[PDB]
Amino acid sequence: ATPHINAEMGDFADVVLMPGDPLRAKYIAETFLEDAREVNNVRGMLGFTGTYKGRKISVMGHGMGIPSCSIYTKELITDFGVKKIIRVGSCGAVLPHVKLRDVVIGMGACTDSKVNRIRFKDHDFAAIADFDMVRNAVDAAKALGIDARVGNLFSADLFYSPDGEMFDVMEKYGILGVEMEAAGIYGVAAEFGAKALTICTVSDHIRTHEQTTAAERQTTFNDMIKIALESVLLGDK
Amino acid sequence: ATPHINAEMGDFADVVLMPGDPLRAKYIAETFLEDAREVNNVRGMLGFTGTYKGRKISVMGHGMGIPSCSIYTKELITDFGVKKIIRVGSCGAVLPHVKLRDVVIGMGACTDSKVNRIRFKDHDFAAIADFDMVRNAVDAAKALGIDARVGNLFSADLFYSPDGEMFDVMEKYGILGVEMEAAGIYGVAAEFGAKALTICTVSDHIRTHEQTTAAERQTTFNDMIKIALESVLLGDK
Amino acid sequence: ATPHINAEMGDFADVVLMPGDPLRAKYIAETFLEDAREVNNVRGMLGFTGTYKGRKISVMGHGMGIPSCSIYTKELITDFGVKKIIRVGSCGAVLPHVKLRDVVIGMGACTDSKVNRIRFKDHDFAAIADFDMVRNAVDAAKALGIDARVGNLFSADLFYSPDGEMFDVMEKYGILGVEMEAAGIYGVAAEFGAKALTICTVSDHIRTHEQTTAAERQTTFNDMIKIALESVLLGDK
Amino acid sequence: ATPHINAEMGDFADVVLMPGDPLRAKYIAETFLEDAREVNNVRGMLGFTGTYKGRKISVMGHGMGIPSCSIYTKELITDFGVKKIIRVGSCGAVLPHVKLRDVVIGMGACTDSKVNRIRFKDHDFAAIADFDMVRNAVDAAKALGIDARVGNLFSADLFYSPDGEMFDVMEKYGILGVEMEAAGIYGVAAEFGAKALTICTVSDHIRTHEQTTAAERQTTFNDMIKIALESVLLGDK
Amino acid sequence: ATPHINAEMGDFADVVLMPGDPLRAKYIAETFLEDAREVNNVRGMLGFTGTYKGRKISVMGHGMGIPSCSIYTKELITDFGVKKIIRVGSCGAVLPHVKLRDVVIGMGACTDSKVNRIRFKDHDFAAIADFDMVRNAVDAAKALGIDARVGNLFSADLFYSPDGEMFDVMEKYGILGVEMEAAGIYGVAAEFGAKALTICTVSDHIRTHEQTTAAERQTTFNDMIKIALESVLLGDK
Amino acid sequence: ATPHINAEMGDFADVVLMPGDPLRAKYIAETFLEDAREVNNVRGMLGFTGTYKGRKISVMGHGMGIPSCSIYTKELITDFGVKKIIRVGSCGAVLPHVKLRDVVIGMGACTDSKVNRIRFKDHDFAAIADFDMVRNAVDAAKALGIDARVGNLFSADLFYSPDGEMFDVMEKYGILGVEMEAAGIYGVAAEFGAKALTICTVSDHIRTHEQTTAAERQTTFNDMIKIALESVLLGDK
Ligand SMILES: CNc1ncnc2c([C@@H]3O[C@H](CO)[C@@H](O)[C@H]3O)n[nH]c12
Ligand SMILES: CNc1ncnc2c([C@@H]3O[C@H](CO)[C@@H](O)[C@H]3O)n[nH]c12
Ligand SMILES: C[n+]1cnc2c([C@@H]3O[C@H](CO)[C@@H](O)[C@H]3O)n[nH]c2c1N
Ligand SMILES: C[n+]1cnc2c([C@@H]3O[C@H](CO)[C@@H](O)[C@H]3O)n[nH]c2c1N
Ligand SMILES: C[n+]1cnc2c([C@@H]3O[C@H](CO)[C@@H](O)[C@H]3O)n[nH]c2c1N
């Protein structure tokens, strides 16, 4: 066990799906996994392990922000033998052609956090996903008839940023979605030699002011989860 | 009422105690307050309001890391009229004479986060607590016969820091505890015009490697809670 | 014509292969393209246009370093209608298992240049390639039976860096090759709305000290050229 | 002796009051101390040692700016055994409701200087005063019927800053006064293990351009000196 | 030989003139040198060695940008024994009193590149020319009837900069000309113990929008080369 | 008058010599100038105006550090019509062949201060002296038979720097002397449109540990003073 995860080696599968909300992790375990059992509840950050189409899968919340998800992902890798992490979250869009409920895959993640500069001698570390994991997700999405855009995400430290101008810069550079964790997960994956991918569903649009309701959530949330789970099966080959 | 808090104006008292762990907030509510009622459960980040010696007080978790706590403290201040925030957390110690379970009060908070540089045109913003709140905490600790050191905390973005050398620098400069939120809360308090204070209980010693369990952190660091609650009464006059 | 390219709209194909060495561009034009004609010679930066299996394609040098290649790629995009740029370069390796003449595909590019910070409000811009172009290159490589690793490159401003320790950091983070332009080309592609990809052939090993001669770099790194050209045909389909 | 102070161990008391102006130090020595003797005059930076209500005390100018006062305070601490340093100076106000003659106590000090980043591995060091010294000054002021605000000062490197908008940022974040030394003295105190405090009199208002009368400066200047001296007696017990 | 220069010790004189355009290097060798021999052609970066008034002198292009010229100047110094480097290039002017065709001598070079910060522990390194070389070029110009202006150049990384405001800052601070290499060459010269100088002819004016005629380009280019060559003879005395 | 200089337009000559020590300014006025009159004594920062061989000249202290001298030089330029400023100071040497009492002229000045980054959009501003003034000082030294090296100075914010390794870097890059003001004076001169020069006499050797006394620094570094004064006369003709 660790100070944040009260479990032991073996309680987690080698692949873990991670939404930011622990309550969504419970929803995933009960809705998509069979024989799911709770393997962690320290700080209410619920984690479960079950099977999907016979394959052992774990799902656990990671909390909001780079510092929060960096703790859980590092521990899962070094203390629980996890090889692959797939964040399945929500994000806001800044591009006019990116619509509410669209699925976006972060091949890369920009950030205003200082964590990768601390790791990389203050130079620019391109926080990227594992290529095969990205391709697997794109193919699974295609199989399910869901188009997914692949590109850069922006992982913000401040949900309430005092710099309103940054959103225009993000739009100019083609950022597909604004969230708060991808760059941190990719930094941890690179630091400890694991593989990661972040998939998000657009839950709010910064330009149109649109927002998903309770219902709109579960529906598009389900598509992203199916993409993630099926992408794992393609990955096993 | 807000994106991360499902409650309405009036559900929260004007003073809110905030541990990072929502289960610690639950324990505090069940053990130190009378007639506590749950006022938030979005994302499992439990928040409660009850009374302490007749005084209305709230307690709610803020999650781990500057990004997470910045969201919750900003929302409490701008949408729930919260005036004072007392963070009651845990921290790792680097100084040889600071022991496990000692209580430290952060009059200031250093950080390796970039959030205050973003707010302060890339200059050095001294993230500090409200002086009267610090004094009330010191006086309450004295009345309770509990030792408490007052000084600088260090708010890290990375619990698992790749820069071990930084701990030697922290020790040289007299840092009392290493945690992950104080500088962020102090930044939000100055940005939106409220008052804050961070009190921590040492949960680990970075040099000796001694540490407390997840269960101990969740429910046994009570000296700091008594100090926090009694300091509020002093502040009321 | 632009200030660095004496050619007219229509002289370049919509896709341009770009080595840093104009003499390598000449070699490519003479041996892989049919009916190639020279379309630029300003500053000796030779550019050509011809056909590959019936497909119109251009090849032009970009010089060494981010500043040099940023000028040429910007002009090709804004003034010559170029849509896709495939850099075909060389790089030094730091990983023990990467060998001389291995082909590496840069899905992302780290850098110690300040150009992307100037573009991105001093935050971390993840300089990435276009996903479809990366996938097309990976598929073309498999079809040709050529191994190719996909990952991060490091675009350095100083070939003769005084910071020897940075190579250990690169190694630790899995950097596939050290070169000098990828991050700059990806920055320009994002700023002006085009698509880019960098493929490199390992020309030196920074740890073992093995290296190829200038003649070898100029005319014998052909696997990457075959991959690049075939990846274009895949993209047209 | 050092290249900056022509004196020997023993010439200075364990507590030193330091105005920026050496002529102000002479004024304090002749007006508030008894049996005052000049102990330094190198570079005209006058320093005196005498007694106040039987307590041995020294008073010496520190010059203008962080680099100047960092030299004097460091030497006093390491070569003359000084334990406590109290800077007594002037500052400009940016807050509309802070008025001339007001006394401000710098519990913390922001800065645009690079000195603390050099000490603290380029992270944010919260330059803070010693808590007991702050408390002692607050109590002394109250005993004298003088009200005093406690908060953040901003220590500027450029009195004639080309960045006028920074004053608006300072105002937004509640900076009580703009001066040029506090952050530097607090950094030295922490580096060499001593205790420090900065007390300032608002000598001018940056917005109203209203400067305090050279007539009313002397009376309040005296208020500040009294608070400082009396605060030292409280600290002794 | 090196990967960038196919020549051997002895092939280059102790003094090398360097325009950015290799074709300009060929022109100089053919027009001003006696018995010029081509000594390098790798990557088309033409280098020649001949004599001027009996003095052995080399001329070779350096390519565009700091990273390109940093490679060549470093190698010339450490592997070919070059002692003095004189860059002869073009620059854009921002000052109203600096005119098209004026000759500017960069006694210093500002830059937005990160290379000198990498060399100088992230502090400000003043990239300067060798004083005697500056003096010799001023005197040579006077003897030829030309009044060169001596001052700061600005070496940009981005010819197509997204920061339009920087030109106004350059003007305010007296920058004589904008080019892309001087600061890099001065950094290499200081790093490896050689002497350097950059002389430029104003080829375009950012404010008046003037542009040098192809005819004006050749006549002025010639005056600059004469100044450079004659300055070398003064330095030998 | 200003809050730092109690004088009016006309009290200062158009050329001002400035040592950091006001007592050295007094010694210079009493020894080299005829009919010197005191024109400022605020904060004990003595300034005088007199004649040298019939030429009106002023001499005034500027205090220690960039912040201190930036105040005085700015005021002299804007409020007192000063056109040229010659700093005559002391510095520590790091090079083996630079000896105590050697005279060095700072053609340029590196720095670890943030003031020029604040002025120059966080890029590298090369803080340089006026070329003609440098030439006049070199010629004056020659005529007087005094040796003088011309090169880079390093202007430090911390006399007692915690980064000892920086001296090795300075030595590697050819720094002639370590002082604390040149870069700041050069920045002010460029910002307000005046001309400046820094000449220093080596007062300590950082490697051999040899050093001069406070008394020697105050009154015996006269060679640099003769060079400075005679350089002004050369500049007038
Ligand atoms: C502008 N819109 C948005 N901005 C920033 N983060 C988010 C998010 C995600 O949801 C949580 C914040 O509510 C975080 O965990 C983040 O990843 N959704 N919509 C967002
Ligand atoms: C605003 N005007 C200008 N801006 C930047 N560089 C240049 C140059 C020089 O010419 C080449 C770029 O065309 C570079 O090698 C550079 O030194 N000339 N005019 C310039
Ligand atoms: C190095 N370190 C960093 N943070 C903490 C903490 C605090 O507890 C949570 C992480 O365990 C965070 O919310 C942080 O503030 N406790 N002990 C810590 C330690 N040793
Ligand atoms: C350390 N290092 C840096 N760049 C390169 C390169 C590439 O080839 C040119 C320099 O040789 C540049 O254009 C760069 O991209 N090849 N081998 C390299 C090496 N070992
Ligand atoms: C390391 N170091 C730094 N500054 C100085 C100085 C100069 O003299 C004063 C400090 O002694 C400052 O004004 C500074 O310019 N002299 N010798 C120095 C030395 N060895």
Tab-separated table of N, CA, C and O in Angstrom, chain C residues 32-34 50-57 144 226 229-230 233:
chain	number	residue	atom	x	y	z
C	32	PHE	N	15.424	9.780	-57.105
C	32	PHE	CA	14.076	9.294	-56.785
C	32	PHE	C	12.963	9.907	-57.627
C	32	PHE	O	11.890	9.316	-57.764
C	33	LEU	N	13.199	11.092	-58.172
C	33	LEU	CA	12.182	11.752	-58.968
C	33	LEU	C	12.466	11.660	-60.460
C	33	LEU	O	13.615	11.516	-60.878
C	34	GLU	N	11.419	11.763	-61.265
C	34	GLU	CA	11.601	11.747	-62.707
C	34	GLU	C	11.353	13.157	-63.215
C	34	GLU	O	10.548	13.894	-62.649
C	50	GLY	N	9.534	17.378	-59.383
C	50	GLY	CA	9.497	16.326	-60.381
C	50	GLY	C	8.359	15.392	-60.024
C	50	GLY	O	7.432	15.788	-59.316
C	51	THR	N	8.398	14.152	-60.503
C	51	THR	CA	7.322	13.237	-60.159
C	51	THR	C	7.855	11.949	-59.591
C	51	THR	O	9.002	11.552	-59.861
C	52	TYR	N	7.030	11.319	-58.764
C	52	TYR	CA	7.364	10.033	-58.176
C	52	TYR	C	6.139	9.174	-58.467
C	52	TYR	O	5.042	9.454	-57.961
C	53	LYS	N	6.316	8.147	-59.295
C	53	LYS	CA	5.213	7.271	-59.668
C	53	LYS	C	4.013	8.110	-60.086
C	53	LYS	O	2.896	7.865	-59.656
C	54	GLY	N	4.268	9.116	-60.913
C	54	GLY	CA	3.210	9.981	-61.414
C	54	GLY	C	2.727	11.107	-60.517
C	54	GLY	O	1.966	11.969	-60.952
C	55	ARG	N	3.165	11.112	-59.268
C	55	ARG	CA	2.753	12.130	-58.298
C	55	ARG	C	3.734	13.312	-58.293
C	55	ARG	O	4.945	13.123	-58.135
C	56	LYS	N	3.222	14.522	-58.465
C	56	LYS	CA	4.073	15.700	-58.449
C	56	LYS	C	4.601	15.879	-57.011
C	56	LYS	O	3.836	15.804	-56.037
C	57	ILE	N	5.904	16.091	-56.877
C	57	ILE	CA	6.527	16.238	-55.564
C	57	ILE	C	7.719	17.168	-55.646
C	57	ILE	O	8.434	17.157	-56.646
C	144	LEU	N	7.465	-1.564	-46.631
C	144	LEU	CA	8.800	-1.671	-47.205
C	144	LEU	C	9.670	-2.615	-46.390
C	144	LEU	O	10.786	-2.914	-46.782
C	226	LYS	N	12.560	6.665	-49.112
C	226	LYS	CA	11.574	5.723	-49.655
C	226	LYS	C	10.297	5.766	-48.792
C	226	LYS	O	9.181	5.795	-49.307
C	229	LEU	N	8.396	9.188	-49.435
C	229	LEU	CA	7.695	9.219	-50.710
C	229	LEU	C	6.505	8.282	-50.743
C	229	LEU	O	5.440	8.672	-51.197
C	230	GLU	N	6.668	7.056	-50.256
C	230	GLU	CA	5.554	6.113	-50.252
C	230	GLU	C	4.448	6.577	-49.279
C	230	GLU	O	3.258	6.351	-49.533
C	233	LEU	N	1.994	8.827	-51.089
C	233	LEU	CA	1.014	8.126	-51.916
C	233	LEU	C	-0.109	7.588	-51.039
C	233	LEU	O	-1.280	7.659	-51.413
